[PDB]
């Protein structure tokens, strides 16, 4: 999720010394809110690092793409440098549309090096299958690797080797169908959009709260400084600060609850990498409908997309 | 004193772990405060009352009402041409900060010796019989000698003043009755003679009048307040751009930097608000120039330490701040000071952000992703392990 | 003041209760913050604890197929150890090492028929074709016992010629 930090002092007062002395005289709530805000960011950085940084070696796809007919130009890095993202990834990125002490911190891992992580991962899958996840990557022609997958599924190798064109045609076509569906059909990234919405809207609230009167004469603490003398000034300011402090604290708690939700979702995503992508999963429907064969990871604005191959009898 | 101490207090511990800690927040402040009100135009007609050629008699004091205009009392107060400036209820100065519903101007002419009786709590012939004022009025009396304008050769007898009358006059009473005053033998019944005298007498001003007997013009301005219609004066100031400034545009007060804007406002629109109703641009009324308001920079200070244990050398990162406004090295997370830029690429030690990290002199680089190795792929090549290793790891999980 | 005794000892009932009411609003706010934050954490810790229970249950009382679930590498086992307020799992895993390449062939043509490792891979050192197992180099003559035939070899892409030892015939002789 977006990493947000809120200057409690400024956001409550906004460059008002007497409001500051009132709030420091009110306790140490600004520390807690800040320091949860931190916790919750550095937790965001930790979701990303966990989910994506499983492999410590950046594997490069060969220059020669002879994978037994399987075409993975659509998921493999584009030499044209649209940020080095596959055409699926560009698609996903352009399918999601992204002052008072509320800043936004930048993520530790840029979109470029996330794409590079996914590329290393995806290349290590094509070359080595699951043995780049258990140690050092071992090459394999990928036709054999798919024979081994089939073996795992509960099919004999001859079924693949006899059928190798058909399966290749088929997996190309499925990739193309993913390509149209993500190109034309909308609402495909509803989860990531919903997260972005729900964050943006918590902010637009908390901002829009910042202009409430909470019983005071006015919501601008300057007009209360400029209209009243100390005693009733501090009175009205105290009311504003009670109200604002309530609003911040609501916000920060709601953000927390979400951060826990997102952390759960991210550790599910890390498990999905770890098992579906760096290996073949026996877990039924865990890595897609049907008998899992493999999965490919793709980056997104604020999440991951797994394209899972599975084998479906018919 | 220094960032490392500031961090030490922020953590309340004299021993700092290697990392980055967010200690404080740096703010810019407004300089060169400015106020701007529109180009210059509706002034009260005080001149029409003061310069007025004709004034009525003291007993026939002329009353005028002033409202729906702007009054500049500074010019009147700082004139030196008036010998009488007595404001009661409010200070003679700082009258430009007061706005009232109505103003009543009572003007007349007397002789100098009688200028004293016009004040609350006083008694006299003129006050009791010609012009009585309230004891607790809130206003100001102005007056000045008018010898050159009210003295005529042979006696200027147009000015009259009442002498005899029975009761007293109540506040704000205008009496024009000319009935012959009775001093008692029988009612005058519109007939004079014994014990029947004309109530009023003529001053008869002459050019050679003495200072006491010389004519004096008097005007009493009473302010009535109970929506105020007549307010104070618009010395606007000059416009300054590209600096954190405290600005006031037609009651809209704010802080920030004003810059030239490409936005096009409609003729009837003054200021523009961004989403969330936060002011974003303002049209300066004097020249109708549209200026974008940007909050003058502010943002967090994070302190990057390798650990007191290792070294007391520190680095500041000013976050989302263009540090031209403060080994300065610019990054997407802000700027870093105190840390040398290098082009190398190591594993990330202290994460700053946007793909830069720091490590220990304190060096700031671009984290490396890991040993980049290309697998020797060939469609008929496999790699098989010939040894193994029994690796024991530890996973810690909180329960309770 | 923040000491409710000095407000009892300095003021008479009405304004006493006033000031006390303010203190109680503030304190009640603080408690309620605290208790909620403690809640949020308790939910977090409960999640972490049920992850830990799953880890017992699968890694310790059994061998896990879940890749990286019970440590990096191919899980072998795990041992539980107590901690002040959590558990520590020491997980054994098997990690291959000391790699070595080999030319492979999805199958083998013999007598016009395609052969397919029954469990293993066909590998060649430079001239000779062995069938090994995947996770450990243990080469072993190609045999009808350790390969299975499936059809001719005009359809497999990349098949290689070789002789499949028949461990009868010398027994007949
Ligand atoms: C991140 C950023 O805006 N860096 C700016 C640069 O673009 C600009 O040319 C210069 C002018 O202040 O200062 C620095
Ligand atoms: C820090 O300094 C103390 C001072 O006694 C030293 O003993 C300790 O080993 C040091 N710690 C680290 C983490 O280097
Ligand atoms: C890094 O250092 C200098 C600029 O500071 C540059 O000239 C040099 O070529 C760079 N080294 C690289 C990019 O390897
Ligand atoms: C495999 O690779 C070689 C070169 O790397 C290529 O010439 C050959 O046609 C490919 N065919 C098979 C069956 O592996």
> For residue A256, how far is the Cα from the chain centroid?
16
Pairing between β-strand B34-36 and β-strand B200-202 as defined by DSSP bridges: unpaired
CA distances from B385 to A54, A136, A152, B382, C142 (A): 21, 9, 20, 10, 20
Cβ proximity of C137 and A123 under 8 Å: no
* Tokens 């930790």 sit on residue: A46
* Tokens 């500074």 sit on residue: B74
Tell me the Cα Rg of chain C.
35
Distance B246 CA to ligand 4 centre (A): 74
A 10 A CB-CB count for B23 gives 19
Cβ proximity of C85 and B391 under 8 Å: no
| Residues in Cβ contact with B148 at an 8 Å cutoff, skipping those fewer than 6 apart | none
The answer, yes or no, to whether any atom of ligand 1 lies below 6 A from the CB of B186, is: no
DSSP annotation of C58? I
Nearest CA in chain B to C104: B380
B-interface mutation test, from C91, C125, C133, most B Cβ less than 10 A away:
C91
CA B62/CA B151 separation, integer angstroms: 20
Single out the residue of B128, B134, B145 nearest to residue B223, CA to CA. B134
Q: Give the residue, by CA position, lying nearest to ligand 4 atom 12.
A: C158
Strands across the sheet containing B271-274 = B34-36, B245-249, B252-260, B289-294, B278-284, B271-274
Q: Give the residue, by CA position, lying nearest to ligand 1 atom 6.
A: B322
Q: B348: which chain A residues are within 8 Å (Cβ-Cβ)?
A: 108
What's the distance, Cα to Cα, between the start and end of chain B in Å?
A: 42
Report the residue numbers after which chain B has a gap, meaning the C atom sits over 2.5 angstroms from the next written residue's N, or none: 40, 226, 233, 234, 326, 360
Tell me the three-class secondary structure of chain A, residue by residue: CCECCECHHHHHCCCCHHHHHHHHCCCCHHHHHHHHHHHHHHHHHHHHHHHHCCCCCECCCCCCCCCCCCCCCCCCCCCCCCCCCCHHHHHHHHCCCCCCCECCECCCCCHHHHHHHHHHHHHHHHHHCCCCCCCCCCCCCCHHHHHHHHHHHCCCHHHHHCCHHHHHHHHHHHHHHHHHHHHCCCCCCHHHHHHHHHHHHHHHHHHHHCCCCCCCCCCCHHHHHHHCCHHHHHHHHHHHHHHHHHHHHHHHHHHHHHHHHHHHHHHHHHHHHHHHHCCCCCCCCCCCCCEEEEEEEEEECCEEEEEEEEECCC
Distance A34 CA to ligand 1 centre (A): 28
Single out the residue of C52, C97, C95 nearest to residue C75, CA to CA. C95
A 10 A CB-CB count for C165 gives 16
Which chains reach chain B with 3 or more Cβ–Cβ distances below 8 angstroms?
A, C
CA A272/CA A269 separation, integer angstroms: 5
Is C44–A161 a contact, with Cβ atoms under 8 angstroms apart? no
C-interface mutation test, from B380, B383, B395, most C Cβ less than 10 A away:
B395
Longest dimension (CA), chain B: 151
* Tokens 């037609």 sit on residue: B250
* Tokens 């290309």 sit on residue: B374
Instruction: Indicate the burial class of C124 (C-beta count within 10 angstroms; 0-12, 13-18, 19 or more).
Output: middle
Tell me the Cα Rg of chain A.
26
CA A83/CA A112 separation, integer angstroms: 6
What's the distance, Cα to Cα, between the start and end of chain A in Å?
A: 41
Q: B25: which chain A residues are within 8 Å (Cβ-Cβ)?
A: 7, 9-10
Instruction: Indicate the burial class of A119 (C-beta count within 10 angstroms; 0-12, 13-18, 19 or more).
Output: buried
* Tokens 């492979």 sit on residue: C104
Single out the residue of C66, C65, C164 nearest to residue C116, CA to CA. C164
CA distances from A191 to A97, A301, B49, B85, B143 (A): 13, 11, 76, 77, 81
Measured over the CA atoms of residue B118, residue B124, residue B130 and residue B133, the dihedral's sign is positive
How many interface pairs between A and B have CB atoms less than 8 angstroms apart? 112
What's the distance, Cα to Cα, between the start and end of chain C in Å?
A: 109
Distance A64 CA to ligand 4 centre (A): 11
In this structure, what token pair is assigned to residue A138? 């071992």
Cβ proximity of A168 and A95 under 8 Å: no
When CB atoms are compared, the residue of C36, C44, C66 closest to A253 is C36
Tell me the Cα Rg of chain B.
41
Is C87–B399 a contact, with Cβ atoms under 8 angstroms apart? yes
CA A76/CA A121 separation, integer angstroms: 10
User: Residue B43, SS3?
Assistant: strand
Helices A190-209 and A230-272 pack at an angle, to 10 degrees, of 170
CA C145/CA C137 separation, integer angstroms: 19
In this structure, what token pair is assigned to residue C28? 């009640």
Q: C60: which chain B residues are within 8 Å (Cβ-Cβ)?
A: none
Is B374–A99 a contact, with Cβ atoms under 8 angstroms apart? no
Q: Which of B296, B330, B333 to mutate to test the pocket of ligand 1 (most atoms within 8 A of CB)?
A: B330
CA B7/CA A302 separation, integer angstroms: 32
The kind and range of the H/E element at C14 are helix C13-55
Distance B342 CA to ligand 3 centre (A): 8
CA B391/CA A298 separation, integer angstroms: 31
Single out the residue of B269, B267, B288, B287 nearest to residue B279, CA to CA. B269
User: Residue B242, SS3?
Assistant: coil
User: Residue C40, SS3?
Assistant: helix
When CB atoms are compared, the residue of C44, C65, C157 closest to A143 is C157
Single out the residue of C137, C139, C127 nearest to residue C163, CA to CA. C127
The answer, yes or no, to whether any atom of ligand 4 lies below 6 A from the CB of B381, is: no
Is A58–B298 a contact, with Cβ atoms under 8 angstroms apart? no
The answer, yes or no, to whether any atom of ligand 4 lies below 6 A from the CB of B15, is: no
Is A161–C114 a contact, with Cβ atoms under 8 angstroms apart? yes
CA distances from B212 to B10, B111, B162, B200 (A): 78, 7, 19, 20
DSSP annotation of B4? H
* Tokens 């402090």 sit on residue: A245
| Residue burial B183-202, b: 16+ Cβ < 10 Å; e: rest | eeeeebeeeeeeebeebbee
């Amino acid at each position: 999720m977006t990493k947000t930090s809120v200057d409690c002092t400024m956001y409550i007062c906004g460059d008002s010394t007497e409001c500051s002395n009132l709030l420091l005289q009110y306790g140490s709530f600004c520390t807690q809110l800040n320091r949860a805000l931190t916790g919750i960011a550095v937790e965001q950085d930790k979701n990303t690092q966990e989910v994506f940084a499983q492999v410590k070696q950046i594997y490069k796809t060969p220059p020669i793409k002879d994978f037994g007919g399987f075409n993975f130009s659509q998921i493999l890095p584009d030499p044209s440098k649209p940020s080095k993202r596959s055409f699926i990834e560009d698609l996903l990125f352009n399918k999601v549309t992204l002052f008072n002490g509320l800043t936004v911190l930048p993520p530790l891992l840029t979109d470029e090096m996330i794409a590079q992580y996914t590329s290393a991962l995806l290349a290590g899958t094509i070359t080595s299958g699951w043995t780049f996840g258990a140690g050092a990557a071992l090459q394999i022609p990928f036709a054999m690797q798919m024979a081994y997958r089939f073996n795992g599924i509960g099919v004999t190798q001859n079924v693949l080797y006899e059928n190798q064109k058909l399966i290749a045609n088929q997996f190309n076509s499925a990739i193309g169908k993913i390509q149209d569906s993500l190109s034309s059909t909308p609402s495909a990234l509803g989860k990531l959009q919903d997260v972005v919405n729900q964050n943006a809207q918590a902010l637009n609230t908390l901002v829009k709260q910042l202009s409430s009167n909470f019983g005071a004469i006015s919501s601008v603490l300057n007009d209360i400084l400029s209209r009243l003398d100390p005693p009733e000034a501090e009175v009205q300011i105290d009311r504003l600060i009670t109200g604002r402090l309530q609003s911040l604290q609501t916000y920060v708690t709601q953000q927390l609850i979400r951060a826990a939700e997102i952390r759960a979702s991210a550790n599910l995503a890390a498990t999905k990498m770890s098992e579906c992508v760096l290996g073949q999963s026996k877990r039924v429907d865990f890595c897609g409908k049907g008998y899992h064969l493999m999965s490919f990871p793709q980056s997104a604005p604020h999440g991951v997309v797994f394209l899972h191959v599975t084998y479906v009898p018919a | 004193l220094d960032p490392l101490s500031e961090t030490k207090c922020t953590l309340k511990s004299f021993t700092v772990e290697k990392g980055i800690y967010q200690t404080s927040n740096f703010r810019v402040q407004p300089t060169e405060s400015i106020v701007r009100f529109p180009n210059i135009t509706n002034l009260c007609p005080f001149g029409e009352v003061f310069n007025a050629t004709r004034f009525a008699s003291v007993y026939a004091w002329n009353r005028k009402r002033i409202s729906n205009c702007v009054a500049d009392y500074s010019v009147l107060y700082n004139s030196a041409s008036f010998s009488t400036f007595k404001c009661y209820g409010v200070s003679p100065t700082k009258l430009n900060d007061l706005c009232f519903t109505n103003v009543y101007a009572d003007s007349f002419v007397i002789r100098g010796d009688e200028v004293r009786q016009i004040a609350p709590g006083q008694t006299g012939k003129i006050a009791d019989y010609n012009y009585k004022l309230p004891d607790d009025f809130t206003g100001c009396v102005i007056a000045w000698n008018s010898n050159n304008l009210d003295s005529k050769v042979g006696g200027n007898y147009n000015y009259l003043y009442r002498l005899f009358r029975k009761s007293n006059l109540k506040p704000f009473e205008r009496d024009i009755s000319t009935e012959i005053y009775q001093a008692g033998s029988t009612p005058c019944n519109g007939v004079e003679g014994f014990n029947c005298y004309f109530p009023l007498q003529s001053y008869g001003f002459q050019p050679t009048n003495g200072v006491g007997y010389q004519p004096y013009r008097v005007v009493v301005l009473s302010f009535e307040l109970l929506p105020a219609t007549v307010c104070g004066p618009k010395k606007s100031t000059n416009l300054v751009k590209n600096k954190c400034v405290n600005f006031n545009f037609n009651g809209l007060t704010g802080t920030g930097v004003l810059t030239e804007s490409n936005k096009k406002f409609l003729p009837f629109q003054q200021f523009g608000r961004d989403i969330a109703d936060t002011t974003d641009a303002v049209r300066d009324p004097q020249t109708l120039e549209i200026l974008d308001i940007t909050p003058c920079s502010f943002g967090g200070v994070s302190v990057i330490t390798p650990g007191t244990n290792t070294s007391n050398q520190v680095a500041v990162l000013y976050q989302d701040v263009n540090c031209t406004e403060v080994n300065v090295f610019q990054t997407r997370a802000g700027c870093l000071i105190g840390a040398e830029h290098v082009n190398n690429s190591y594993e990330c030690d202290i994460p700053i952000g946007a793909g830069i990290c720091a490590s220990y002199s304190i060096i700031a680089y671009t984290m490396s992703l890991g040993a980049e190795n290309s697998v020797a792929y060939s469609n008929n090549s496999i790699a098989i392990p010939t040894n193994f290793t029994i690796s024991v790891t530890t996973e810690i999980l909180p329960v309770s | 003041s923040s000491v409710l005794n000095d407000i009892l000892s300095r003021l008479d009932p009405p304004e006493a209760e006033v000031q006390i009411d303010r203190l109680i609003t503030g304190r009640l706010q603080s408690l309620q913050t605290y208790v909620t934050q403690q809640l949020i954490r308790a939910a977090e810790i409960r999640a972490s604890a049920n992850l830990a229970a799953t880890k017992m249950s699968e890694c310790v009382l059994g061998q896990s197929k879940r890749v990286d679930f019970c440590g990096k590498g191919y899980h072998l086992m795990s041992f539980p150890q107590s901690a002040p307020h959590g558990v520590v799992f020491l997980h054994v895993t098997y990690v291959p090492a000391q790699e070595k390449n080999f030319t492979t062939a999805p199958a083998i043509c013999h007598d016009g028929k395609a052969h397919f490792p029954r469990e293993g891979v066909f590998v060649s050192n430079g001239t000779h074709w062995f069938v090994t197992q995947r996770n450990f180099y243990e080469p072993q003559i190609i045999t009808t016992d350790n390969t299975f035939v499936s059809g001719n070899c005009d359809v497999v892409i990349g098949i290689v010629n070789n002789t499949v030892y028949d461990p009868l015939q010398p027994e007949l002789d």
